[PDB]
Ligand binder design. Structure first.
Ligand SMILES: CC(C)(COP(=O)(O)OP(=O)(O)OC[C@H]1O[C@@H](n2cnc3c(N)ncnc32)[C@H](O)[C@@H]1OP(=O)(O)O)[C@@H](O)C(=O)NCCC(=O)NCCSC=O
Ligand SMILES: CC(C)(COP(=O)(O)OP(=O)(O)OC[C@H]1O[C@@H](n2cnc3c(N)ncnc32)[C@H](O)[C@@H]1OP(=O)(O)O)[C@@H](O)C(=O)NCCC(=O)NCCSC=O
Ligand SMILES: CC(C)(COP(=O)(O)OP(=O)(O)OC[C@H]1O[C@@H](n2cnc3c(N)ncnc32)[C@H](O)[C@@H]1OP(=O)(O)O)[C@@H](O)C(=O)NCCC(=O)NCCSC=O
Ligand SMILES: Nc1ncnc2c1ncn2[C@@H]1O[C@H](COP(=O)(O)OP(=O)(O)O)[C@@H](O)[C@H]1O
Ligand SMILES: Nc1ncnc2c1ncn2[C@@H]1O[C@H](COP(=O)(O)OP(=O)(O)O)[C@@H](O)[C@H]1O
Ligand SMILES: Nc1ncnc2c1ncn2[C@@H]1O[C@H](COP(=O)(O)OP(=O)(O)O)[C@@H](O)[C@H]1O
Ligand SMILES: Cc1ncc(C[n+]2csc(CCOP(=O)(O)OP(=O)(O)O)c2C)c(N)n1
Ligand SMILES: Cc1ncc(C[n+]2csc(CCOP(=O)(O)OP(=O)(O)O)c2C)c(N)n1
Ligand SMILES: Cc1ncc(C[n+]2csc(CCOP(=O)(O)OP(=O)(O)O)c2C)c(N)n1
Ligand SMILES: [Ca+2]
Ligand SMILES: [Ca+2]
Ligand SMILES: [Ca+2]
Lengths: 548, 550, 550
């Protein structure tokens, strides 16, 4: 009895916990997608490997197991490099399976012959071309384990066409057991005590909850830590939901004031990178003290020195903090000038955005549109929010009540992930509603994938906030001097719903928002809501821009 | 106010980060770097080839837990140093290669020694960076140092253009980070600690393997207490020798092939299941062997063979967890089992086989007769640089180590060319110790010129060459039309190289010369070279399996 | 029928492709490759370090127009050989590095010397490939050879796993390509030939520069006929020396800085406007200089300075076009111009400055006094391996070359470590010639062990060391607490290294020793080593500009 290399890899992937595969078929990976379906792996055929590679990385973040992207040789694999880099930037587990020309045709100028290993090298923790068919399960298990052990990351498997279509005896093939979950590593006890001792000396302490705690499934231990200590906390863009965004101790409406004045910050799975302004002045105080919790030891002390390094798993380390807090109880006083200054800043920004929510001007503004979107999103729904102002204002206006329920451009600030991450969320959570909120430019990067979501019957609603271009476009286009960031004025993107027989809606006035969004979200097929806004609407004014 | 050059900034930053030694060769454009380093108190060693200097930097990283620094000129100087980057990459040792580069405003012009040096170092480094400006040089130095010692230790590369080295900025606009502290010693979950000890109590033929990862973690005291308390048989890796003294009664080194082939549960303390351990696979292991793996690299867990209990973290801290759990729940392996009896029987058989080889006075001499006098005259706390094939492999079993991190060999990469460089690195780290360099005649040739480097800097090194006329032996006379590829000049008098620097060189052929020559040579104020001729038929003890599993 | 191993296939394919020499060091897994190569008639040279062996392979490529082959073991052996790949990359010389690799079925296991060797060689090679199967080995060998010599010549790398080397296939399923013929000598458009000659007739101060690209193209006869017919002044690049005999009356080598600074039109015959020619930019050139560029690489045209007439193609064929067009439309530069007068005046001034330096009998001696006796005793057709800084730069101007491709120096990459390797390469290519190796004391240390390699293979090489106690000089006594970074042991007796292989070593300090020592040394049946001490204050002739433009 024989078995093909495609049937070996599909059986090895399924045994290693792979349940979702995204990509596009063709020479030579056609039998791999067929064998994947026979093993129970759900395969999603995309319209471009770029979006499919982004969807695989989102699965790794949502599940702790690598999403798999399948691509053909040459240009197909290169399109999927975008997913490798995005998973590399966010430390997400992901595997790109790229076909390759037959091994005995190397050097001949074979069909789509390309240096695919060296192309994937800068963004992968692991890259391998399996030497033989019988050893395929070795490479599948080693790639899966490398993506999820240590600091999570991406891997690339280079499959020549003759390894895929060739056959061996089943008795030759050894299959490793399913890769167990890695051990949740602890921090030394003297560091746990030093972290709590430093918190007792702080006058203006602050907790920052990043998506590292979300990936670590640490939402329970993190909330118990914040509530026991009574510390004010700031959630990162994709860290919101780990603690419900309606929590009384959130200081999200005073973000700039909190970062600028805190004297001790606890980074719970969050990097002091561009998203946190490198922890440097003027966005921070020059003498801010840092307690850093991260599984990557190399990340400790980046840009600003770390006083207490907590290297290890976020859930296990936070469990250490809560256990020591039970032995020596401590909590931050609820009546301090730090709290008074924080709440005073929260009330000032609350009154600033209050009239924006109730502004019925036409063309509409961001806050008026997102208010009706916010009030219709189910509490357990997954939010795919992409764009510039559409994503930034949606970050503050759209709350998350559970961890790992927001997917945005993330660390790499990538446009082109919206529809793919929405499809990834739908595959992981088939019992939930997926709300995709994109800017008009962000929608164009992968707009064809709305047919992909409809083809597989995914419960996704596509909302487009349109201001006629990248950060806005004019109402009329001078055909001689077209602004480089502008698109066709009032482009009817909702008409793309007619491609697959869905319902598209065009919205310009505030009275349409609530009935259109409610009706579109109840459609059996994915609906597209195209909402026009003024090219002059913007976020709440700030002392500092987000790009330091 | 006052200004400062990039070279002086780099030297000051390196000194703040704990760098005391710098090995390399000067030239355009890194001359002021070595000058400023000596001005700061950093001892610079001028080698004869950057290849040997880069190997020395990686050995300093293993011996100290702090990155050894190699300084190389642009182009071919940095490329010569990639060998050391790759060797530190293979052994997970901390080191920094500081390579000069052509002036940035001359890129694309065909500048002097213009080369893609970042991309050349990329496959073997955890961190490669060209500092963008002179003022941010301390940022890159601290980031490189921290990346080499945090997490799984490894190599890094700093690409310094000439204008960044020779240019100047005001001192007021330069910020120096604090000295990078040692990384936290990571613990394993207490459930895994109990699971590892509970698995040991189910094993009928358990085995402990002590690797050089436990040596790098400075975990010798915890590793010894663990093996003594449990009473378990233990095997030392080639550079794991010394963590527990090699004369320990629980060592089964003389029954290595038997222990690996019959153990049912092995505890890997800082050692990989790579080519050295035959991938943990049959026929060298049992196909159902259970593994307790202790490693700082989570990605290493489960390689080749599955791991039953994973102990991810620092060896010293995790071994302290095992010892603490043993004091709470005592247990020890019995001293009277059939496992001990089979191990002791195999030890006595291999001891009887090699016993007459130690006393064979035949000329040309054999490995065991020569290594016997080296073993018995070496200071008990000396540091051994052992390199070659049979010279290193037989020297591994014959020459014992009683302290951790006192043996330096070809290591995981099996590299020829590290012998003299690692001996120089050991001397620079331990100036109060005697360094013994035991190389085969071929391995000595890879970096033989560096004997003058050791003499120039007054290092307490004694060079011993075990010469069989080539790579694994060569004939006594050479056919000019049929010279074997691995042969050298018969009776090559390498000891005459001691006359280059005014040292003494010895030529040994008969056993009556061994003891008086080695005694006088080791007492010389200059590095002596003892060229000992051996038979080209001499080889190691016969084994059922070769060391290279394939 | 009969079977054949991959090693025997590689050796047979290399022999068919014209490979006669193979330099390197054997070991796992490339032992049968060197054995099969010797079985085929390929002469194998066992070096002491692959670094020097890889430099030797590139020198063979320059001397023959056919790729020199370097054989290296897996891991660190191949990484040592990257230095030669980079040197061939910098000089556009054909060479192949054949590096072994671990067994393919052991990838990912931590196999012996497992390393990303393709990616390590990538930045410096035109072609890197791991043969997919044993039967297709001749395909990869011919493709590698052809890629090294077709187009702009360069380096290539072949990654051979151990199982591909030791495995066997039937001979019937192996196809061997024909011997790769020499590439066609490409012509320039006849409109560009006329445009180049018409531009020459408008120049008031024209200059011809002969580079080693014209030497590689075997274009010496056409280049000499071109310069003689036109009567133009010509300057020879460092390794362009010998294309036209250096005693030619039209050479303006003694007025180099004046010629470059005042020429209004230059003809580049196989020479780049890189760091050697100071990028063709002021202050070393006039900002309005016109350029006629002759190069096989179209991408090189117009680098740094614009090219008025582009002559893309083979130097020999294009120079033959210029000579053919000159016979059809005769022209020559007049022998009586102010340009000639200024050049001749500058030559006589520099000759008068260095004339007493040649005759200075002061002790410690100077460069010019020592190089005078080397120049006057060298055989007129000898091949010179000159390496170092001042030793190489002054030796470039003092030691003349009368035949093309008879000087081998640090070349474009300015590499230290090529001296002995290139001397061995020259001897292997020209066994009927005397090879003279003139190195500084520092450059000798980079590959000093290879003197035994030259002696073991009976090569007619004489090693001369110009010793000033370090890199650019060192003190007479060393302060143990303040050793300069570029200093070595004072009065280091490197000549004692000749006693390693039974040769004769000489120590020279006074001028009365120069002539009798050099005469006796060059007549020795074994490679002699002449260690000549010079003053640490001796330097080259004073110049207005330094050689390093920055
Ligand atoms: C880098 C950042 C984390 C920086 O955060 P900020 O935008 O500066 O703060 P935000 O949390 O988003 O909130 C913005 C402001 O709204 C205030 N805010 C927040 N919540 C509220 C509520 N509930 N009510 C009123 N006001 C609020 C908050 O205090 C800030 O004002 P102040 O406190 O007064 O400042 C983020 O901007 C980000 O991730 N941007 C993504 C960049 C990107 O990838 N773009 C796409 C590619 S573009 C090429
Ligand atoms: C890969 C290895 C770990 C494999 O270990 P082995 O050599 O097989 O075992 P070793 O521990 O070295 O010991 C060899 C044999 O001697 C026995 N032995 C050990 N100690 C003693 C004593 N004290 N007395 C008697 N016999 C002894 C031991 O039981 C073995 O026999 P048996 O039990 O009967 O087998 C090692 O060989 C190694 O690291 N080699 C390095 C290779 C290298 O890098 N070469 C340079 C590049 S070459 C291209
Ligand atoms: C870059 C260079 C081409 C630059 O050429 P220069 O040295 O400036 O000129 P050279 O031709 O070598 O000659 C030097 C001077 O001697 C004069 N000269 C030349 N020949 C003669 C004779 N026969 N008689 C008298 N004077 C002479 C010549 O006019 C120059 O003076 P003036 O006309 O008055 O200037 C060369 O220096 C070079 O290739 N250097 C290699 C550097 C290197 O790789 N070093 C090793 C690594 S170091 C890290
Ligand atoms: N299981 C885990 N436990 C702890 N930290 C983790 C874990 N997984 C990833 N991390 C770390 O969390 C950090 C996330 O940083 P970042 O993505 O910048 O957060 P955010 O963007 O939400 O601020 C990464 O540095 C990563 O090393
Ligand atoms: N501080 C540390 N604590 C625990 N393990 C470590 C530490 N530093 C390195 N290691 C691990 O030790 C292992 C050493 O394995 P190896 O070099 O194969 O040892 P040997 O060659 O002696 O068998 C590496 O895999 C490395 O991840
Ligand atoms: N057969 C050939 N015909 C013409 N030009 C060639 C040939 N082979 C190589 N070249 C060119 O000659 C040039 C040599 O330049 P370079 O090495 O800088 O010479 P030098 O160092 O002597 O100035 C290279 O740019 C190369 O492209
Ligand atoms: C791959 C990629 N290409 C380009 C960009 C730059 N970029 C950031 S936001 C954006 C589009 C902004 O327009 P839109 O999404 O419609 O948002 P809004 O106008 O509401 O801000 C672009 C092109 C990017 N981040 N990623
Ligand atoms: C950089 C490098 N080049 C080549 C080799 C191959 N190699 C392994 S051992 C050895 C030399 C063996 O001879 P010697 O050191 O004299 O020891 P002996 O076995 O003869 O005692 C060589 C060249 C290597 N391991 N590393
Ligand atoms: C591979 C490499 N390492 C280092 C250098 C830097 N370098 C240039 S010349 C030189 C040695 C100069 O001394 P020596 O050869 O003795 O000549 P001298 O100038 O003293 O006559 C060195 C180390 C280099 N060019 N290449
Ligand atoms: Ca927009
Ligand atoms: Ca030997
Ligand atoms: Ca010198």
């Amino acid at each position: 009895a024989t078995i093909t290399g495609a049937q070996i890899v599909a059986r090895a992937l399924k045994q290693q916990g792979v349940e979702h595969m995204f990509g596009i078929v063709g020479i030579p990976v056609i039998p791999i997608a067929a064998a994947a379906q026979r093993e129970g792996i759900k395969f999603y055929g995309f319209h471009n490997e770029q979006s499919a590679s982004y969807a695989a990385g989102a699965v790794g973040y949502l599940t702790g197991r690598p999403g798999v992207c399948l691509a053909v040789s040459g240009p197909g694999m290169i399109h999927g490099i975008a997913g490798l880099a995005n998973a590399w930037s966010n430390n997400w587990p992901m595997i790109l399976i790229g076909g390759a020309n037959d091994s005995y045709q190397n050097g001949q100028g074979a069909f789509q012959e390309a240096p695919q290993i060296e192309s994937a090298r800068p963004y992968v923790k692991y890259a391998a071309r399996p030497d033989s068919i019988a050893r395929l399960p070795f490479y599948v298990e080693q790639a899966v384990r490398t993506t999820i052990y240590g600091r999570p990351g991406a891997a690339y498997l280079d499959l020549p066409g003759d390894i895929i279509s060739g056959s061996v005896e089943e008795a030759e093939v050894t299959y490793p057991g399913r890769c167990p979950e890695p051990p949740r590593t602890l921090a030394p006890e003297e560091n746990i005590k030093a972290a709590l001792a430093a918190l007792k000396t702080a006058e203006r302490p602050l907790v920052i909850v990043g998506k590292g705690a979300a990936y670590s499934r640490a939402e329970d231990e993190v909330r118990k830590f914040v509530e026991t200590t009574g510390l004010p906390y700031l959630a990162s863009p994709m860290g919101k939901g780990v603690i419900p965004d309606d929590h009384p101790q959130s200081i999200a409406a005073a973000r700039s004031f909190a970062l600028q004045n805190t004297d001790l910050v606890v980074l719970m799975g969050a990097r002091m990178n561009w998203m946190m302004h490198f922890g440097q002045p003027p966005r921070w105080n020059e003498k801010v003290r840092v307690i850093q919790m991260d599984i990557s030891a190399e990340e400790i002390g980046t840009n600003v020195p770390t006083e207490v390094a907590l290297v290890g798993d976020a859930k296990a380390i936070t469990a250490q903090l809560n256990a020591e807090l039970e032995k020596n109880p401590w909590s931050y006083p609820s009546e301090t000038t730090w709290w008074t200054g924080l709440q005073s800043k929260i009330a000032a920004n609350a009154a600033t955005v209050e009239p924006m929510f109730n502004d019925d001007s036409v063309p509409m503004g961001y806050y008026r549109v997102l208010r009706d979107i916010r009030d219709l999103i189910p509490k357990d729904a997954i939010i795919s929010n992409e764009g510039a102002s559409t994503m930034d204002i949606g970050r503050t206006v759209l709350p998350n009540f559970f961890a790992r329920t927001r997917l945005d451009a993330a660390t790499f600030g990538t446009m082109g992930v919206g529809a793919g991450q929405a499809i990834a969320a739908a595959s992981v959570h088939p019992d939930r509603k997926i709300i995709c909120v994109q800017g008009d430019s962000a929608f164009g990067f992968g707009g064809m994938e709305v047919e992909t979501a409809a083809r597989y019957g995914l419960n996704i609603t596509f909302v487009i906030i349109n201001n006629n271009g990248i950060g806005g476009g004019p109402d009329e286009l001078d055909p001689a001097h077209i602004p480089p960031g502008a698109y066709t004025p009032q482009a009817h993107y909702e008409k793309m719903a007619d491609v697959y027989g869905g319902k598209g809606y065009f919205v310009t006035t505030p009275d349409q928002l609530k009935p259109v969004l409610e009706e579109a979200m109840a459609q059996p097929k994915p609906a597209i809501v195209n909402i026009m806004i003024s090219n002059k609407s913007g976020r709440k004014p700030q002392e500092f821009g987000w790009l330091t």
